């Protein structure tokens, strides 16, 4: 809860152009992996 909330609100993916480094896709999970769970 407060842990997942902490890491979530602290940083999270957004529509930027710096994703060209390695084209991250863990955003899709970590956004709502254990949040709401």
């Amino acid at each position: 809860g407060t842990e997942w909330e902490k890491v979530a609100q602290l940083c999270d993916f957004n529509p930027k152009s710096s994703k060209q480094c390695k084209d991250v896709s863990r955003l899709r999970s970590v956004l709502m992996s254990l949040k709401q769970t």
């Binding site: 890491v7 602290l10 940083c11 993916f13 710096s18 390695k22 991250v24 863990r26 970590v30 992996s33």
Partner: protein, 230 residues
């Protein structure tokens, strides 16, 4: 319509001694054919620069040195920063170090944040990122590692980040610093601290990426080998 120019530098003094309030109109009228550097240098002696601030805000377009330095000093005294960000972003004809000395000890989180910011305008990490360790565990020190684009800067950062047990937001320390990390040391220091929860999704993206890599490369090699036949 006057021929010479010294009468400007006398008439500014004239008004300032007599009708200083009606000086801004002359300043706006007379800015074109005027060395504003001498104007600010003379005003620093008498020290009525806080009066003429909005005028210099207009003159800033010329991007003069003393103009920038003085108006930034006045933003410092006024304790305003939103305009300071626009000044430094839109204009760069000034030294960053002198401003940094004042901003990094301005009693205020935001000014010190700017003191950390403009260091990278000189391409000087290892002090900015380190400066904001002192106060900002709120993700800001973590973000400069990504734009730094330099390995063995996040590694030190993450190791320090585990020197204190604030593992909660370790998972973010790799999200933005993803490309600047090698899974070897990541897995090592993660198994060290007996942490895999909110550490695995790094390895998840990795075991997606390299799977796609090996599959794609097998496909390309099969294609090339099949085309070797013909």
């Amino acid at each position: 319509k006057v021929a010479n120019v010294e009468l400007y530098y006398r008439a500014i003094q004239f008004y300032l001694e007599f009708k200083p309030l009606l000086l801004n109109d002359l300043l706006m009228v007379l800015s074109p054919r005027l060395d504003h550097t001498r104007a600010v240098n003379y005003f620093s002696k008498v020290k009525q620069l806080p009066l003429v601030k909005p005028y210099l805000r207009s003159v800033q377009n010329h991007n003069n040195k003393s103009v920038n330095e003085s108006l930034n000093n006045l933003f410092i005294t006024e304790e305003d920063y939103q305009a300071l960000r626009t000044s430094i972003d839109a204009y760069d004809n000034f030294d960053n170090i002198s401003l940094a000395q004042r901003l990094e000890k301005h009693e205020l989180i935001e000014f010190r944040r700017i003191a950390a910011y403009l260091f990278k305008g000189n391409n000087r990490w290892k002090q900015s990122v380190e400066l904001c360790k002192k106060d900002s565990l709120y993700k800001d020190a973590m973000q400069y590692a990504s734009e730094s684009k330099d390995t063995e800067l996040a590694e030190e950062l993450l190791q320090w980040f585990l020197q204190e047990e604030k593992r909660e937001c370790f998972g973010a320390c790799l999200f933005t610093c993803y490309d600047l990390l090698r899974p070897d040391v990541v897995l090592e220091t993660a198994w060290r601290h007996n942490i895999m929860d909110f550490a695995m999704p790094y390895f998840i993206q990795v075991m997606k990426e390299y799977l796609t890599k090996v599959d794609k490369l097998d496909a390309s090699e099969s294609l090339r080998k099949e085309e070797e036949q013909a």
